[PDB]
Subunit: 491 residues, 3 copies
Amino acid sequence: NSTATLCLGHHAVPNGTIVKTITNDQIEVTNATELVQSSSTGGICDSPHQILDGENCTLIDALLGDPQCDGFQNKKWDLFVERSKAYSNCYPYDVPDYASLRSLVASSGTLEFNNESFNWTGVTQNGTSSACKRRSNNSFFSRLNWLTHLKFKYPALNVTMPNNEKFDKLYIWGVHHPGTDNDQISLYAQASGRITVSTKRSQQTVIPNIGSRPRVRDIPSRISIYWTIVKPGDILLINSTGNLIAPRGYFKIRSGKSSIMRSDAPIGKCNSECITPNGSIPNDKPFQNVNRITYGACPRYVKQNTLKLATGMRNVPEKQTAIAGFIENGWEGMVDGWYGFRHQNSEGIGQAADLKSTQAAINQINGKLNRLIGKTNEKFHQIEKEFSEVEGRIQDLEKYVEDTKIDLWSYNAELLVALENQHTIDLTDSEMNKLFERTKKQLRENAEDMGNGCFKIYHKCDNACIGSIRNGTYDHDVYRDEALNNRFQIK
Amino acid sequence: NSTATLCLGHHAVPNGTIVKTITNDQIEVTNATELVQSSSTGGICDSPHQILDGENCTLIDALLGDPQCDGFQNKKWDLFVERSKAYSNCYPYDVPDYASLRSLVASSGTLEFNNESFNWTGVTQNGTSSACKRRSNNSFFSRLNWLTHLKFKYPALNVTMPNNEKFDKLYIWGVHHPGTDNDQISLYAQASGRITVSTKRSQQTVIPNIGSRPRVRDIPSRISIYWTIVKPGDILLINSTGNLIAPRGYFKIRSGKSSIMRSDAPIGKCNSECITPNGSIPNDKPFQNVNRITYGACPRYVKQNTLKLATGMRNVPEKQTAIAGFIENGWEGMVDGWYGFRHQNSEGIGQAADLKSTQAAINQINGKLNRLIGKTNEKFHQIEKEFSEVEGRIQDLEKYVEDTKIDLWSYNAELLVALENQHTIDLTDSEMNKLFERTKKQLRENAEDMGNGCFKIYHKCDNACIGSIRNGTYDHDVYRDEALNNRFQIK
Amino acid sequence: NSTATLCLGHHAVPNGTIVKTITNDQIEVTNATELVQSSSTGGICDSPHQILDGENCTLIDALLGDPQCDGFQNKKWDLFVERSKAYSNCYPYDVPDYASLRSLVASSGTLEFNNESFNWTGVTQNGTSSACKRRSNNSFFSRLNWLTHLKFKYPALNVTMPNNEKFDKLYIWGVHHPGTDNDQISLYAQASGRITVSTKRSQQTVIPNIGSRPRVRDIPSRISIYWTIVKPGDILLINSTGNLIAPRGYFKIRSGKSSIMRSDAPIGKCNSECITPNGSIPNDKPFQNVNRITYGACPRYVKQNTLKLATGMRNVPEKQTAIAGFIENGWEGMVDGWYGFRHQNSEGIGQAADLKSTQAAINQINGKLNRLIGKTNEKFHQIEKEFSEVEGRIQDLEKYVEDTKIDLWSYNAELLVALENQHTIDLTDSEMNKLFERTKKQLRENAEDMGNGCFKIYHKCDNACIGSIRNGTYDHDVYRDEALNNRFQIK
Ligand SMILES: CC(=O)N[C@@H]1[C@@H](O)[C@H](O[C@@H]2O[C@H](CO[C@]3(C(=O)O)C[C@H](O)[C@@H](NC(C)=O)[C@H]([C@H](O)[C@H](O)CO)O3)[C@H](O)[C@H](O)[C@H]2O)[C@@H](CO)O[C@H]1O
Ligand SMILES: CC(=O)N[C@@H]1[C@@H](O)[C@H](O[C@@H]2O[C@H](CO[C@]3(C(=O)O)C[C@H](O)[C@@H](NC(C)=O)[C@H]([C@H](O)[C@H](O)CO)O3)[C@H](O)[C@H](O)[C@H]2O)[C@@H](CO)O[C@H]1O
Ligand SMILES: CC(=O)N[C@@H]1[C@@H](O)[C@H](O[C@@H]2O[C@H](CO[C@]3(C(=O)O)C[C@H](O)[C@@H](NC(C)=O)[C@H]([C@H](O)[C@H](O)CO)O3)[C@H](O)[C@H](O)[C@H]2O)[C@@H](CO)O[C@H]1O
Ligand SMILES: *[C@@H]1O[C@H](CO)[C@@H](O[C@@H]2O[C@H](CO)[C@@H](O[C@H]3O[C@H](CO)[C@@H](O)[C@H](O)[C@@H]3O)[C@H](O)[C@H]2NC(C)=O)[C@H](O)[C@H]1NC(C)=O
Ligand SMILES: *[C@@H]1O[C@H](CO)[C@@H](O[C@@H]2O[C@H](CO)[C@@H](O[C@H]3O[C@H](CO)[C@@H](O)[C@H](O)[C@@H]3O)[C@H](O)[C@H]2NC(C)=O)[C@H](O)[C@H]1NC(C)=O
Ligand SMILES: *[C@@H]1O[C@H](CO)[C@@H](O[C@@H]2O[C@H](CO)[C@@H](O[C@H]3O[C@H](CO)[C@@H](O)[C@H](O)[C@@H]3O)[C@H](O)[C@H]2NC(C)=O)[C@H](O)[C@H]1NC(C)=O
Ligand SMILES: *[C@@H]1O[C@H](CO)[C@@H](O[C@@H]2O[C@H](CO)[C@@H](O)[C@H](O)[C@H]2NC(C)=O)[C@H](O)[C@H]1NC(C)=O
Ligand SMILES: *[C@@H]1O[C@H](CO)[C@@H](O[C@@H]2O[C@H](CO)[C@@H](O)[C@H](O)[C@H]2NC(C)=O)[C@H](O)[C@H]1NC(C)=O
Ligand SMILES: *[C@@H]1O[C@H](CO)[C@@H](O[C@@H]2O[C@H](CO)[C@@H](O)[C@H](O)[C@H]2NC(C)=O)[C@H](O)[C@H]1NC(C)=O
Ligand SMILES: *[C@@H]1O[C@H](CO)[C@@H](O)[C@H](O)[C@H]1NC(C)=O
Ligand SMILES: *[C@@H]1O[C@H](CO)[C@@H](O)[C@H](O)[C@H]1NC(C)=O
Ligand SMILES: *[C@@H]1O[C@H](CO)[C@@H](O)[C@H](O)[C@H]1NC(C)=O
Ligand SMILES: *[C@@H]1O[C@H](CO)[C@@H](O)[C@H](O)[C@H]1NC(C)=O
Ligand SMILES: *[C@@H]1O[C@H](CO)[C@@H](O)[C@H](O)[C@H]1NC(C)=O
Ligand SMILES: *[C@@H]1O[C@H](CO)[C@@H](O)[C@H](O)[C@H]1NC(C)=O
Ligand SMILES: *[C@@H]1O[C@H](CO)[C@@H](O)[C@H](O)[C@H]1NC(C)=O
Ligand SMILES: *[C@@H]1O[C@H](CO)[C@@H](O)[C@H](O)[C@H]1NC(C)=O
Ligand SMILES: *[C@@H]1O[C@H](CO)[C@@H](O)[C@H](O)[C@H]1NC(C)=O
Ligand SMILES: *[C@H]1O[C@H](CO)[C@@H](O)[C@H](O)[C@H]1NC(C)=O
Ligand SMILES: *[C@H]1O[C@H](CO)[C@@H](O)[C@H](O)[C@H]1NC(C)=O
Ligand SMILES: *[C@H]1O[C@H](CO)[C@@H](O)[C@H](O)[C@H]1NC(C)=O
């Protein structure tokens, strides 16, 4: 009736989602996406990393050559998987600093072994035991050589092996601790004496200690395992009068991205970049709360089990019912755009989406999605994070380092999502406000702001006229005389 | 005189406080609150954590059973407090890896001890010394058993103790290092020989070393202390020909939240969640600069001694004196609200608070207070952070881990408070701006913006009229003819 | 022609720089500055820290007194620089826990040595070797004393040295491991026996181990090095029957800010606070990607090789050509200010800078520069971050601690710069918007907003009139009758 109404508005949905911003602990938005990965398939995917399933073998048993581990000879891995069911089935042994030898072999990622011809003239080689059976016969660790007397003589060993290669050699060797004096004499022909293994740059001396230990596979003796790395140009010197469990050669030691993980998860024929002890997990999300132990391109571990990133504007119910604009009011019936126009004129009541504002909001949200989704970084060999034995100081430090790290990342995650969500609310609010301001400016003196996100346009404004406003081609001069007469009439 | 003035404004206070934002290193606000706890009472509150005051006893002395520590037998703790005055008063001893045994016992949180009947047939038990008096008589550590020859014989000990319990057993034992060959023979009847303590899964051999050490309580000998954990189903085997300081049984070893702290603070009858070596501290604040060593639900340690969180808007002096609005001007006389209205009309000059805007600002500030205040998290046994001896590598790492952690938290604290304060300034500024905009919209063509946060209303607007604007019931149509004539008159 | 145009605008430059904000991965601004230091001179500046260039000597060789290191006696340092070319040229030795002794001496920062008169009655002193020549003669480590038999007797040593000083004493000593039984007898007159060095609070026993090691400088024997710290009031007791490499006195041990660094960078005559192995670097910037190893007041190490901080507003091309304001349009021709006014009136078309808005933007940007530039903090002795040997557990932890730290700082840097740049864009946009709003308010009913950042002023407004608007002295009442007639005329 000589005027029209033009309202600016934004969509709303019936099923919104609650997120956290800096301004609000809980604010409902039109949509959100989860940034914490909280589930796994439960299987370790055999691709794209080279998996070695230890089965009944620990890495150290596979290294020494426990008979059940013969199948592992010379294999490589990106990730060696050690099973809780694993058990030793050879001569009872220990490794002082077991954790370090495990770690250095794990990180090297290879069991490649090269035999060498040591001169063991004057002694008997290849000692075996019923505690270490291979194909039902008494045997021993494959990579070790139990030397004993020859004709009740054990002449002092003073044996050399030069490293004339261009790579390092890793030697694994041991000392036999007999149960009794009787065993000492029966095995080596004389009283126990120390073993010294040296190079130009290092030395280790180990004393065999006679005594009963609790029987394991009916063996009260023990073997203690040691290692030596020999550089190119250096020489291994082995010096012993008995009790030597000698090396048969060396392991290659390599550097790269290999590691070891304790897990009982089955190995699957599938492809996944991120491995945890619970199974492989997708790495689309920036964070995860599945396990602090990871290998590969993995989301960062956080304490939160959910963090929702807003991917839409504030969700505002439509006030119940004159058309009305965005002031405390969303439009559930606007389904082809995020922002738009509703009008009332001579020809009826209509709605149209505004593409520009809708696309600007969507583009920006997609931009932050692109920064946060599918952008994980790889980590490989790290520190251990679960422990089967009590140890004190070093373990306290390992645990505190990891606890510290997780709390700092959990804090970063919490802040990041609150900041991002505040920014999303601000940028989506801003597109609405800019649309309203642009429209106000077009209309000049031909309309007044009704306070509800709508303009009273003080002239006849048919469908084409409204279209000209929406398209940005409205010429205010054309209508100004009509509008001014209508606005500043005296009633 | 045919018009009225309506000004929008906000309060101001005579005693504002300076805070930091992202925009300003120093900006005065109406009020702030401190987020760094910087004082302690100076006492350790005995509630709600179970405190054990070591008095003259270290934990290790209480474990071994130094006579002055007999009162500690079998006690438990959440926090064992070790005093600087503590001193040993029994046989001179050392503990290789003292720090680890201290740590593992501290974390276990119990001195529960179960006696066992070891078969020491063939030797004399219960050796004592004048260096370790109990009730004025020569004595020894309560939990240890100094075995010596019987009739100048010391038959080889080969003694067993199975763990048929469903929990782990912690055994503490030792080796006696005699001052001279004469002592060796007088005590054990033969030359010194090694001690081996083993289980199915582990072994330790220790060599007694004869020699003079500086006398302590007139004793040139030493005892060295060792420990062994025996799992259920396993067996302790002790094998010795002399110099054995034997266990009398085992300690329970538990897991939980127990720890140990070095402090000289007195223990008080009071209740506080957070304990530091300086005393308990309140844990209302998110940060603290009292001590990096903490136990319980504690604020996080930061380097800053103060961080002030704004709890009010910018504080702006009232310009000296026509009423005027918020543009570069606060209202010290507005004491019943944070924002409001001042008017001049036919009936005088008045002021009224706006509840809605005031409450919206207060609610939001209370929200951020609720997130930051009284929300501390608990930590228990951690790593040591002060050291009485120089050690090198491990200590360097312990110190660097803690330094690293504190710098990262101090950074987080600094950023958090700057961000929060910027947000507080922004949300309080926003309530002022929204109040002004809402008012502008009500007034439509009946008023003009005077540029100083006030409107010139171009009609007679009595107290009820002004009230209708403040209440949001003003009907612009009622006054529009009058206002338009007044606005667009030609003078 | 009875009207004027007044446009508000901001500068633009032909050569802008791309930065990252929270809103945009790439946004062009007028200027930026680099926050990551990525180059070094390549030399270590000898000022202001006290540098000690080890040349051919490691710290440990300088400590023991290898002949080529005699020049180092008693010197101090802030930073000891160890060269890759360094080599030992004396008796072949090792140090169990070499890394710790290196670290504790490095951190102490002094080689100050005080000779003491030990009573070595009954033995020969000052043993020497061809493996350790000094001025072409057979010699030995300067700070050690190789004792051997006197007249084929080596009476048991039981020797004391009290610490009656008020500072700690650091004693360095050793054990000689002879190649053969023949050497043992030729040197010490009897079979090898253990060495015990003790105090009231500590003890160490070391066993000499006879055996061939690979010859070095024709020596198949080895010396193993040990250390003891003796507190004031305590006593050093040395107890040996042979194989003792005795101390000649003690080192002072101090506490302070000293460290050690591995580098081949030459030492220069220059002054720089921050030292890295690549050379000294400037410390103006808050971050650096030169080296994770640093000493002194240094930028923090990050993974990024560049982080650009915006130091100007968004850079917006001038739309091609009616004068026009800031809406999607910057002014390349405005060179004497950041914001300003362009006008068209009766007297022509002019431009003027607005000082207030320009200065407010510049001041704020300078403020954030002042917070970020030249504000680095000092760190001194830390942990090692590069390793020449494989070690396992401890090294894994050292590496993980540093990796963890760097990732957290790299994250903080990335967020900080994105946040700061967003704030810079917001504050510079805000000065433009405030200038426009201030102008709008002055003009009252005398102008209309043309939508392009300009006002149509509906009255004759000559150069003085425009000046009154720019100066904030424009009196709208003077022109209102003229303007209203022009605005609300009917055409
Ligand atoms: C050298 C020798 O033959 N010694 C005999 C002892 O082995 C034997 O004590 C019994 O030993 C039993 C285990 O027998 C082996 C084994 O481990 O299988 C037989 C091995 O050939 C022998 N290995 C070598 C390289 O000689 C090995 C070794 O002696 C022990 O493992 C060392 O602990 O023993 C089993 O443990 C019985 O319980 C045990 O009594 C005694 C008595 O028969 O005679 C010795 O001559
Ligand atoms: C076995 C014995 O009686 N040995 C005598 C030596 O103790 C003694 O040397 C003197 O020893 C003095 C301390 O006497 C005790 C003690 O610690 O109180 C007496 C204890 O009963 C004895 N403990 C046991 C279990 O036999 C203990 C032990 O021998 C030492 O502590 C080992 O160091 O000694 C005190 O230290 C005197 O300064 C010291 O001369 C000599 C000489 O009298 O005779 C030995 O038979
Ligand atoms: C005590 C003595 O003189 N022993 C003689 C052996 O040294 C010698 O074996 C030869 O030793 C050669 C090195 O000679 C020195 C040295 O290091 O320069 C000479 C030193 O004076 C002696 N040091 C002391 C304090 O006595 C030192 C020491 O014996 C060795 O370093 C211990 O390893 O030896 C060189 O190594 C030759 O290759 C080696 O054969 C034998 C045979 O000549 O006679 C011993 O009496
Ligand atoms: C030191 O004490 C040890 C524990 O008491 C003891 O070990 C025990 O030795 C017996 C036999 O002497 C073993 O008994 C075994 O006997 C049958 C054959 O009759 C075997 O088939 C079984 O394996 C059976 O167990 C015990 O197993 C063994 N116990 C432990 C815990 O090791 C040592 O022999 C004693 N040492 C000396 C030198 O006397
Ligand atoms: C190795 O040298 C040691 C230090 O010189 C020496 O220890 C000293 O021994 C004397 C006695 O021989 C102690 O003197 C004590 O004598 C009176 C009784 O007359 C006691 O009441 C006092 O305790 C007094 O101190 C020294 O205390 C002691 N010094 C130290 C530092 O331990 C060893 O005895 C020597 N060892 C051998 C085997 O000869
Ligand atoms: C244990 O075996 C060792 C390695 O086979 C052996 O060491 C070698 O000893 C020879 C001499 O016996 C040294 O040869 C040196 O001889 C000339 C003089 O003719 C010297 O000028 C040279 O230095 C030359 O090298 C070897 O250097 C040495 N090799 C190594 C690697 O140390 C030990 O001697 C044997 N030990 C015993 C006790 O027999
Ligand atoms: C290292 O090897 C040497 C021989 O090269 C051993 O020395 C011999 O030991 C025997 C037995 O004790 C003696 O009877 C010989 O006289 C020694 N030979 C020489 C040349 O001295 C030595 O025992 C071995 N070392 C170890 C620790 O086993
Ligand atoms: C561990 O106990 C065994 C006995 O079970 C000890 O062996 C005896 O030692 C004595 C003294 O040296 C010898 O005379 C006996 O002949 C040994 N008995 C047997 C059966 O061999 C052994 O010495 C003890 N071990 C330690 C380290 O003390
Ligand atoms: C520490 O010094 C003592 C002497 O104070 C040494 O004891 C003597 O050792 C010799 C050689 O073995 C014996 O013949 C004497 O009888 C011992 N004297 C006494 C009083 O017992 C002892 O050997 C030295 N200890 C070490 C580890 O070298
Ligand atoms: C909600 O957001 C995510 C991320 O943009 C998108 O993949 C998903 O399809 C959206 N859901 C709906 C119903 O729009
Ligand atoms: C592992 O050991 C179990 C239990 O002894 C056995 O049944 C199984 O077949 C073994 N698996 C392999 C792959 O050797
Ligand atoms: C993964 O395994 C850990 C350790 O057993 C367990 O605490 C956690 O609940 C598991 N997470 C999932 C998603 O299975
Ligand atoms: C200032 O702020 C704190 C926190 O809101 C409040 O407890 C305190 O009472 C306030 N002081 C005044 C005078 O309003
Ligand atoms: C602790 O020792 C001191 C000094 O010897 C003594 O005076 C005090 O009574 C002792 N306190 C306790 C509780 O035993
Ligand atoms: C707490 O104790 C530490 C260490 O003695 C001291 O540096 C610090 O100043 C103390 N703080 C307070 C608030 O007493
Ligand atoms: C750009 O910014 C930096 C930091 O403010 C300043 O030092 C430099 O001179 C500026 N360059 C120009 C051309 O304005
Ligand atoms: C260091 O050793 C090299 C190589 O032997 C020698 O040429 C050089 O002169 C030595 N430098 C010093 C400062 O002693
Ligand atoms: C500094 O040295 C390290 C280690 O050699 C090297 O990786 C890095 O590229 C160097 N940086 C510069 C700027 O020279
Ligand atoms: C072990 O060594 C012997 C040398 O006696 C050699 O012939 C063979 O390779 C090995 N024999 C067995 C049975 O493993
Ligand atoms: C020590 O052991 C003996 C065994 O001889 C036992 O009777 C008693 O429990 C203890 N005696 C003393 C005095 O502590
Ligand atoms: C080594 O000690 C002797 C004692 O025999 C002393 O005279 C001199 O200071 C030293 N002699 C040499 C040659 O270094």
